[PDB]
Amino acid sequence: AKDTAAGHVTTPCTEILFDLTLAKHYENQIQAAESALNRNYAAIRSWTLLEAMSSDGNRQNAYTGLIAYGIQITVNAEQELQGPKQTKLRAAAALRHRAANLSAALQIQAAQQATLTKPTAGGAQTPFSGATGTCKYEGITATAGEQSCKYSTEDEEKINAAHMNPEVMTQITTIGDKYLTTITLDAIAGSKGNPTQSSATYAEQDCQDGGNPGPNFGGANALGLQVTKLGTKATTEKTNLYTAGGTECEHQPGNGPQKTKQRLAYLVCEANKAAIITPTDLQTLTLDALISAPEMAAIGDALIQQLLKKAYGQTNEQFQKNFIKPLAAQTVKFKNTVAALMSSPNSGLALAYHKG
Amino acid sequence: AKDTAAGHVTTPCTEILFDLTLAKHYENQIQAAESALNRNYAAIRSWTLLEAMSSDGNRQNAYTGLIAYGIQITVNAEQELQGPKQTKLRAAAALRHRAANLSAALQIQAAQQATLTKPTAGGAQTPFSGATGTCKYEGITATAGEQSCKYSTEDEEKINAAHMNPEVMTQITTIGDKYLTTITLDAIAGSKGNPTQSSATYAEQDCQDGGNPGPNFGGANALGLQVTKLGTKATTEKTNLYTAGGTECEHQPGNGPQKTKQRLAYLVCEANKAAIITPTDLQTLTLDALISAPEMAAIGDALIQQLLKKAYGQTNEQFQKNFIKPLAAQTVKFKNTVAALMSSPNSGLALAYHKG
Ligand SMILES: *[C@@H]1O[C@H](CO)[C@@H](O[C@@H]2O[C@H](CO)[C@@H](O[C@@H]3O[C@H](CO[C@H]4O[C@H](CO)[C@@H](O)[C@H](O)[C@@H]4O)[C@@H](O)[C@H](O[C@H]4O[C@H](CO)[C@@H](O)[C@H](O)[C@@H]4O)[C@@H]3O)[C@H](O)[C@H]2NC(C)=O)[C@H](O)[C@H]1NC(C)=O
Numbered sequence A, B: 001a002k003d004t005a006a007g008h009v010t011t012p013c014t015e016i017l018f019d020l021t022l023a024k025h026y027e028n029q030i031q032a033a034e035s036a037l038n039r040n041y042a043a044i045r046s047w048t049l050l051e052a053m054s055s056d057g058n059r060q061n062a063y064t065g066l067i068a069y070g071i072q073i074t075v076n077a078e079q080e081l082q083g084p085k086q087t088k089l090r091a092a093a094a095l096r097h098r099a100a101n102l103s104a105a106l107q108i109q110a111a112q113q114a115t116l117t118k119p120t121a122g123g124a125q126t127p128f129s130g131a132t133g134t135c136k137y138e139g140i141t142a143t144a145g146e147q148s149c150k151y152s153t154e155d156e157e158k159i160n161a162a163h164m165n166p167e168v169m170t171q172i173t174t175i176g177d178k179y180l181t182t183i184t185l186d187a188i189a190g191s192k193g194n195p196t197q198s199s200a201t202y203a204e205q206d207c208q209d210g211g212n213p214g215p216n217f218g219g220a221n222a223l224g225l226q227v228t229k230l231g232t233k234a235t236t237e238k239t240n241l242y243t244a245g246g247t248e249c250e251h252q253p254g255n256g257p258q259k260t261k262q263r264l265a266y267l268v269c270e271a272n273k274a275a276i277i278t279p280t281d282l283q284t285l286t287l288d289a290l291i292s293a294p295e296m297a298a299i300g301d302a303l304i305q306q307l308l309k310k311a312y313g314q315t316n317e318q319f320q321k322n323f324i325k326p327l328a329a330q331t332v333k334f335k336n337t338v339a340a341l342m343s344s345p346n347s348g349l350a351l352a353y354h355k356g
């Protein structure tokens, strides 16, 4: 089942929810990858301190092996994140920009009831050079109270990051441009008798004179207008992310003018295709992941799997004991635990103290 | 001279420029601080490799001293950046959100000329139960072509990050809320003769019959209306950032409903007060900055200024020679330069190779 989330966009408010939810999904992908990097850098500082506290040459080289491995994979992953990060943030920014746009248009398109001003009566005058009576209104306004989008339980279940993996997204749905550009209104004129410039009784927000002027054109001669409603109807449109063959993004820029929906579809397509690679979590590393890691062959040689097990352990249970558990369990004292210490104000000073 | 930039905001387009320029200023402050951290972390990896390549105990401890110093100040600065980062990004996001809002409202407020539809003639009908003639229009619209903000040389000189240091900012200027909420229009009705439901000649986008219907109410009986212009005038408003005493932010939330301008002023105030502390640049460190650094007293003792000069040099010229120049000049070979190598895919492997 593809396009669960986009297929739930049927209104300005649900497009706003989709756009903000997808932007947050891209932002969270980046935050998760950067958190993984930060955890890895914290583990490298932890092993650096443990290396300095070792008195055994072979245990020292073991910590060195983990430091080298962690630096390699984490520096690489940080460099490889930058492209996908920029692509995903470009889309997140555009999606947030669009959601802001739609919400501002929603507020104006809610201004659906007019307040008339007191008119001024005339005879012929532009744009009615042939009239004998005119009734001129200046500064009619329409304003709505503060609007807000209300979402149901199902809106939040369907338009949800859980349904925004790249494998299920093939299109976006957007509100038509006229909602963002066009004022629409109905209006009606009414006449009775022989309205002229002397129809200057304005108590009913129209032009009356003669007889007994009052409600419902009470007077002999009357002219007026009313703006009976305003507001442009929202419509929805679909835009595909991919070409017909499904690999390539469909709406690449630089080929001629594009509509907002096409620019957004292109950015979303590129952000979906820009997959992030997260490196191994050093702080929860297992023995098998370490000796299976392609990078440890050249590292272990420099400092093969048989050798790695002799350095790091025959079971993961003792690998955990010797190399993982100390980060949160080994207490360091001088004048905190390892990993907290090496992410603290005294991190460098703990290292200097123990290398002497 | 305070408020050069805000005092140049006199139009929706210049408020948009101010809001986007200030958001970019906050974002650039964060990017600059994070670049400084990344440079420092790169220097720490560089000295780590040089430590591994040293055969001399005292030169090894010297590199260790720089590693410990760099870890201390850079980890601390990274932790201290997080609060100010969040505060500045909260303001940048809000400013961008506002600029999006204003730009969307600008497009709609540019829709200032109406297109009439063909009316339908009637007799009495709501909301003119007392009329003898009515002329009813449905779906009158107004749309503008695509609007764009054009800025002069001086607009870009005055509304500029160069004028957005916290010491010179005391207020923000914003467009009044009615620009974002209210449709405004003028309209006029015209009548001639005795218009009724038989005034059904619509060729002039009004209701005519009798005689020779045509331009300018050519016919005997005529009724019509025109919407002669639309668009709400932008006004500007000032909001102070600080209380009267000047220390505290003026528009703290949680004290009752606030207007957009007050929420923005509060965020800007907090972002201005959230100063970033950037640590020393390790890659351009001088001897005097090192031995003067408060952190090096406990570090040098562990591994006093007299001792530091004996370890790092009597002049900065030899400190540069021994500890700074090698990062970009010392070539490392095995089967690149130091600093590039230790930020490369082979960073960890270079370290492992040389510690053996
Ligand atoms: C860019 O333009 C958009 C569109 O105009 C603006 O979006 C509006 O922003 C305002 C302020 O955030 C929104 O108003 C807020 O709505 C919240 C939810 O409203 C409903 O739901 C609550 C229950 O959750 C009901 O109680 C309520 O009756 C509604 O049914 C309210 O909870 C907020 O209230 C808080 O602030 C107000 C005003 O300060 C106080 O009076 C309240 O006591 C309380 O403190 C608030 O009303 C509005 O809904 C948004 N509109 C849309 C269409 O999204 C952006 O603000 C604007 N951005 C910038 C930066 O300019």
Ligand SMILES: *[C@@H]1O[C@H](CO)[C@@H](O[C@@H]2O[C@H](CO)[C@@H](O[C@@H]3O[C@H](CO[C@H]4O[C@H](CO)[C@@H](O)[C@H](O)[C@@H]4O)[C@@H](O)[C@H](O[C@H]4O[C@H](CO)[C@@H](O)[C@H](O)[C@@H]4O)[C@@H]3O)[C@H](O)[C@H]2NC(C)=O)[C@H](O)[C@H]1NC(C)=O
Binding pocket: A094, A095, A097, A098, A101, A256, A257, A258, A259, A260, B100, B103, B104, B106, B107, B146, B147, B148, B149
């Ligand atoms: C949220 O809502 C806002 C407000 O509506 C939208 O902002 C508009 O965005 C569009 C598209 O970016 C802007 O249109 C662009 O304007 C550029 C500058 O226009 C002028 O200056 C150039 C010279 O620099 C003159 O040649 C030109 O005549 C104008 O005087 C143009 O350079 C852009 O042209 C490019 O795209 C168009 C359309 O695809 C092509 O036809 C062109 O050939 C060229 O490829 C473009 O016209 C518009 O100005 C913005 N309006 C405002 C008020 O800021 C946001 O787009 C919207 N955001 C989202 C994400 O929904």
